[PDB]
Amino acid sequence: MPMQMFMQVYDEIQMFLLEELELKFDMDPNRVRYLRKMMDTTCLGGKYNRGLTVIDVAESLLSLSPDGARRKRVLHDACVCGWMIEFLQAHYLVEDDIMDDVTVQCAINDGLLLKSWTHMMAMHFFADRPFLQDLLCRFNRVDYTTAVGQLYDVTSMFDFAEFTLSNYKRIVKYKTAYYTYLLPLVMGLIVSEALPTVDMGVTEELAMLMGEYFQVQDDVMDCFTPPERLGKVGTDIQDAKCSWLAVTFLAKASSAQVAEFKANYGSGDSEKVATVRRLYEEADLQGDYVAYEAAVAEQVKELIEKLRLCSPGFAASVETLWGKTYK
Amino acid sequence: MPMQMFMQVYDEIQMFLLEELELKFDMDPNRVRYLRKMMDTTCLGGKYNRGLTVIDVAESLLSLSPDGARRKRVLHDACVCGWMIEFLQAHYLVEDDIMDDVTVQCAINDGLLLKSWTHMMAMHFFADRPFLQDLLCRFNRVDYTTAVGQLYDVTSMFDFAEFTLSNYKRIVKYKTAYYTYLLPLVMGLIVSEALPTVDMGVTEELAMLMGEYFQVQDDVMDCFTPPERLGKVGTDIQDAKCSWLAVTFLAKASSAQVAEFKANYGSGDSEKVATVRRLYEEADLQGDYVAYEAAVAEQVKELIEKLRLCSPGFAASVETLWGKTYK
Ligand SMILES: O=C(O)Cn1c(C(=O)O)cc2ccc3ccccc3c21
Ligand SMILES: O=C(O)Cn1c(C(=O)O)cc2ccc3ccccc3c21
């Protein structure tokens, strides 16, 4: 039911956005169809885990409520919010695709339209909701945060001085955790009108920890999960990314090993990448990964309990989010 | 005084944005300085005619008022609004520079930050102004409009069917007129609290006409003004742009001339570009330019009078905007 509900609302948002262009922005059918296809290609394909998280938070607050004929209103709002994040994520992916000629002009334009669509859908569907101003401001701030996080990530090499766990955490927090973990949880709370009933501190902390757990797992999979299983080719080593593997390796490697790492990192050359993988393997980083992740897991599991004592319905949605991340 | 005032407020906005990053977004001095330099490079250099228009509208409404100790408040607000448009323009120019690798990653990131900065500066400087919500919504809608205009422009060739004056007007209106002419005039009215005292219809019409007059002049200069005088190399012919010259030529050229135009347009080849220039010259389009612009001038001069009979102070600022465009 959640996925079927989410797809049903997508059709509603899409029809609104496309008719608005036709009726108010003087768009020709050809461009309207081009935008329908582009919207489908960029917004549909994934697992929708950011969007579905909004539904799961709202669904937990209806079944485990702190109501009647207005249930379908909360679920609909959860779906528009879910699509705002999915469209913002779609916007970032297009931006990333430019980062790595009418095709370039169209990709840039798609990036701009996807972001503008998040505002358009909010302004229409939530037009007379009292939460509209707070929702717009939290969304925009998270978007700024992400772009700032993207700066810390893209310029993490200037070179190895910023390869620290505190800077890694700074990158994860700003680049990933705010829009991937904090925002879906917060949007599900906004639509349920249950925002001041939860400890934001514990939630922010949980979002940053789950973001950390997810990014650490993502960094490790990028290096060790083969392309057919991973879906794409792992490029963190070549790109000289400030990854969890790099910063953990640099704190436990010997001076010679660090010298060997510095001379081989950030190169497209097959043998240098293999030397890096060999160094990670030999420094028992896959073992350290298990312990770091299990220590994060202990911290996550402890904070969910603190949350459950004041906000039970919310803690069970933060538990399902965690289960998805943990597996 | 306007320019000195505008630069003084830029220093204030810049300091706010940069301190906000340092104190609230955990930014290191190195990146703060990098962003100061990028902000200066992208926002400072031009003639500031969009930004200054906001000041000139507010200045006309203080000297020709429909007040006392709150004069400096209106002028300050006019300067923050002026910088919002200058930053949005800076955002579009960066986006255009990508349209024609840490440099590409940084340009994309700069594009995102410049747009996010327009929201950040508005949310801070106008935090408890009652006009904040209306200002944010009008700004965002104009930004969407521009991206839609950029779609009509970039895909004007699909090929010659869209080379009509009504489509040219559609491109100009959405791509240029809304953010260049309508928005600065509207923002100067918002800060002066004189928005419902003016006929929006006549103003929209004037903005679209001045936008048309400016784009027609810009299109003609791109073709005939030499690179040392123009500042840059004219590429409209090569790019196969839906320019005023192209659409006017296609309505007055003979079937053979149109055939000759179609076989030569949209090519980088020096001889084909020269053939296009020769066709424009031989079809007396520089003569037609004078008559089209003078007919637009007659329409502009007539609408300013209608505006002056109800909103005199506003008409004199729309007159100065016009004088700048006309010369
Ligand atoms: O579908 C996604 O957005 C990505 N994704 C995937 C995936 O199948 O790629 C698994 C998984 C687990 C938890 C998530 C939590 C927040 C956001 C995304 C998550 C996620
Ligand atoms: O400075 C600019 O923004 C561009 N510019 C120029 C220039 O010197 O390039 C002349 C001129 C005249 C009128 C304008 C009206 C609105 C926006 C820009 C205008 C403009």
Side-chain angles (χ1 to χ4, degrees):
Chain A
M1 195 77 80
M3 185 72 84
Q4 183 239 300
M5 172 63 111
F6 196 56
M7 293 309 290
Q8 212 182 308
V9 177
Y10 175 80
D11 293 347
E12 194 182 337
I13 294 163
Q14 171 171 89
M15 193 84 85
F16 163 69
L17 294 177
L18 301 179
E19 283 177 351
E20 174 192 54
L21 283 164
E22 176 200 356
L23 307 159
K24 289 168 243 152
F25 294 91
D26 203 30
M27 197 164 271
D28 49 278
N30 295 293
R31 284 174 176 81
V32 175
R33 290 196 307 274
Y34 153 83
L35 290 178
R36 182 181 280 104
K37 191 195 171 260
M38 183 277 283
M39 197 192 290
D40 287 347
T41 304
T42 64
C43 303
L44 313 179
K47 209 182 163 188
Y48 313 106
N49 275 324
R50 273 167 202 77
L52 291 163
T53 298
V54 191
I55 300 156
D56 191 64
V57 172
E59 207 95 51
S60 292
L61 279 145
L62 302 147
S63 191
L64 305 295
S65 51
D67 210 357
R70 227 161 186 249
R71 170 197 168 84
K72 232 251 185 177
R73 208 220 77 253
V74 168
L75 293 157
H76 189 267
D77 287 358
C79 290
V80 179
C81 273
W83 282 115
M84 288 173 74
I85 319 172
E86 291 297 323
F87 278 53
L88 186 64
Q89 164 69 349
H91 152 84
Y92 297 141
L93 295 171
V94 161
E95 297 295 327
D96 300 345
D97 290 348
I98 308 155
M99 265 154 64
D100 54 46
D101 204 2
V102 209
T103 192
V104 183
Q105 288 180 318
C106 281
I108 282 149
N109 183 253
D110 295 342
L112 299 179
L113 294 174
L114 287 157
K115 183 47 166 97
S116 283
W117 283 337
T118 76
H119 296 177
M120 301 319 287
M121 71 176 82
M123 279 290 302
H124 173 253
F125 288 100
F126 310 140
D128 245 308
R129 297 280 194 274
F131 65 69
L132 184 61
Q133 190 69 309
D134 185 56
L135 189 94
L136 289 174
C137 296
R138 289 181 188 267
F139 191 87
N140 290 330
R141 198 167 174 93
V142 162
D143 175 59
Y144 182 48
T145 299
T146 314
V148 170
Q150 283 171 8
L151 180 53
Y152 298 147
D153 190 50
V154 145
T155 193
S156 76
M157 1 67 181
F158 194 106
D159 194 288
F160 286 103
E162 294 202 333
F163 278 53
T164 67
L165 208 60
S166 67
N167 186 56
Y168 175 73
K169 281 184 199 167
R170 180 179 67 153
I171 296 167
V172 182
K173 161 166 177 229
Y174 288 84
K175 183 195 78 179
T176 301
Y178 272 80
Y179 92 100
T180 305
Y181 289 87
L182 191 66
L183 191 64
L185 293 171
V186 161
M187 288 187 120
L189 282 164
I190 294 168
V191 301
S192 299
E193 297 140 61
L195 180 78
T197 78
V198 299
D199 198 298
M200 201 44 69
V202 165
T203 303
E204 281 200 26
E205 213 189 320
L206 270 161
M208 305 307 111
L209 287 178
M210 288 193 292
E212 274 188 50
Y213 187 92
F214 187 76
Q215 198 58 68
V216 165
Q217 179 162 312
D218 199 16
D219 290 358
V220 164
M221 284 171 355
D222 189 278
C223 178
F224 298 105
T225 303
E228 65 277 12
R229 213 146 57 88
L230 186 68
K232 278 95 170 186
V233 205
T235 188
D236 286 347
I237 297 164
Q238 291 95 334
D239 296 351
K241 292 277 110 200
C242 174
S243 83
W244 179 82
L245 290 161
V247 313
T248 311
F249 169 85
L250 288 167
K252 79 177 289 173
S254 65
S255 50
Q257 280 174 301
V258 165
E260 197 182 343
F261 174 84
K262 288 192 197 220
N264 284 273
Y265 208 63
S267 182
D269 187 72
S270 312
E271 288 144 62
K272 293 197 212 98
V273 172
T275 299
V276 174
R277 283 205 207 93
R278 176 211 185 204
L279 282 162
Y280 289 165
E281 285 265 325
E282 292 171 351
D284 193 4
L285 297 198
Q286 262 180 307
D288 278 36
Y289 162 70
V290 170
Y292 193 90
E293 293 290 70
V296 169
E298 278 178 324
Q299 290 172 289
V300 167
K301 285 166 177 73
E302 281 168 346
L303 285 163
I304 290 165
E305 291 281 298
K306 300 185 97 68
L307 205 59
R308 163 137 51 230
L309 264 64
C310 315
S311 317
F314 185 62
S317 74
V318 88
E319 189 61 69
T320 274
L321 185 55
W322 173 242
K324 294 190 255 203
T325 311
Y326 183 84
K327 287 200 84 204
Chain B
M1 195 77 80
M3 185 72 84
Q4 183 239 300
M5 172 63 111
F6 196 56
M7 293 309 290
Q8 212 182 308
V9 177
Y10 175 80
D11 293 347
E12 194 182 337
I13 294 163
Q14 171 171 89
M15 193 84 85
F16 163 69
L17 294 177
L18 301 179
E19 283 177 351
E20 174 192 54
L21 283 164
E22 176 200 356
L23 307 159
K24 289 168 243 152
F25 294 91
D26 203 30
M27 197 164 271
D28 49 278
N30 295 293
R31 284 174 176 81
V32 175
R33 290 196 307 274
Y34 153 83
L35 290 178
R36 182 181 280 104
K37 191 195 171 260
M38 183 277 283
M39 197 192 290
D40 287 347
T41 304
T42 64
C43 303
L44 313 179
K47 209 182 163 188
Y48 313 106
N49 275 324
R50 273 167 202 77
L52 291 163
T53 298
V54 191
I55 300 156
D56 191 64
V57 172
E59 207 95 51
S60 292
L61 279 145
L62 302 147
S63 191
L64 305 295
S65 51
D67 210 357
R70 227 161 186 249
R71 170 197 168 84
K72 232 251 185 177
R73 208 220 77 253
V74 168
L75 293 157
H76 189 267
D77 287 358
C79 290
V80 179
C81 273
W83 282 115
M84 288 173 74
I85 319 172
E86 291 297 323
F87 278 53
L88 186 64
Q89 164 69 349
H91 152 84
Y92 297 141
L93 295 171
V94 161
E95 297 295 327
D96 300 345
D97 290 348
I98 308 155
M99 265 154 64
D100 54 46
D101 204 2
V102 209
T103 192
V104 183
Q105 288 180 318
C106 281
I108 282 149
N109 183 253
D110 295 342
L112 299 179
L113 294 174
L114 287 157
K115 183 47 166 97
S116 283
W117 283 337
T118 76
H119 296 177
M120 301 319 287
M121 71 176 82
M123 279 290 302
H124 173 253
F125 288 100
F126 310 140
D128 245 308
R129 297 280 194 274
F131 65 69
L132 184 61
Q133 190 69 309
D134 185 56
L135 189 94
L136 289 174
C137 296
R138 289 181 188 267
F139 191 87
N140 290 330
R141 198 167 174 93
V142 162
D143 175 59
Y144 182 48
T145 299
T146 314
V148 170
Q150 283 171 8
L151 180 53
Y152 298 147
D153 190 50
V154 145
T155 193
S156 76
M157 1 67 181
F158 194 106
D159 194 288
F160 286 103
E162 294 202 333
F163 278 53
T164 67
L165 208 60
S166 67
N167 186 56
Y168 175 73
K169 281 184 199 167
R170 180 179 67 153
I171 296 167
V172 182
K173 161 166 177 229
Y174 288 84
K175 183 195 78 179
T176 301
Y178 272 80
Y179 92 100
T180 305
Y181 289 87
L182 191 66
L183 191 64
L185 293 171
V186 161
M187 288 187 120
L189 282 164
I190 294 168
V191 301
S192 299
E193 297 140 61
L195 180 78
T197 78
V198 299
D199 198 298
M200 201 44 69
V202 165
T203 303
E204 281 200 26
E205 213 189 320
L206 270 161
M208 305 307 111
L209 287 178
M210 288 193 292
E212 274 188 50
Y213 187 92
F214 187 76
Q215 198 58 68
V216 165
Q217 179 162 312
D218 199 16
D219 290 358
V220 164
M221 284 171 355
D222 189 278
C223 178
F224 298 105
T225 303
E228 65 277 12
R229 213 146 57 88
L230 186 68
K232 278 95 170 186
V233 205
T235 188
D236 286 347
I237 297 164
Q238 291 95 334
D239 296 351
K241 292 277 110 200
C242 174
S243 83
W244 179 82
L245 290 161
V247 313
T248 311
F249 169 85
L250 288 167
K252 79 177 289 173
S254 65
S255 50
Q257 280 174 301
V258 165
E260 197 182 343
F261 174 84
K262 288 192 197 220
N264 284 273
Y265 208 63
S267 182
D269 187 72
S270 312
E271 288 144 62
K272 293 197 212 98
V273 172
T275 299
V276 174
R277 283 205 207 93
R278 176 211 185 204
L279 282 162
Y280 289 165
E281 285 265 325
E282 292 171 351
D284 193 4
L285 297 198
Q286 262 180 307
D288 278 36
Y289 162 70
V290 170
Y292 193 90
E293 293 290 70
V296 169
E298 278 178 324
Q299 290 172 289
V300 167
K301 285 166 177 73
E302 281 168 346
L303 285 163
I304 290 165
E305 291 281 298
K306 300 185 97 68
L307 205 59
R308 163 137 51 230
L309 264 64
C310 315
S311 317
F314 185 62
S317 74
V318 88
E319 189 61 69
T320 274
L321 185 55
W322 173 242
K324 294 190 255 203
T325 311
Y326 183 84
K327 287 200 84 204

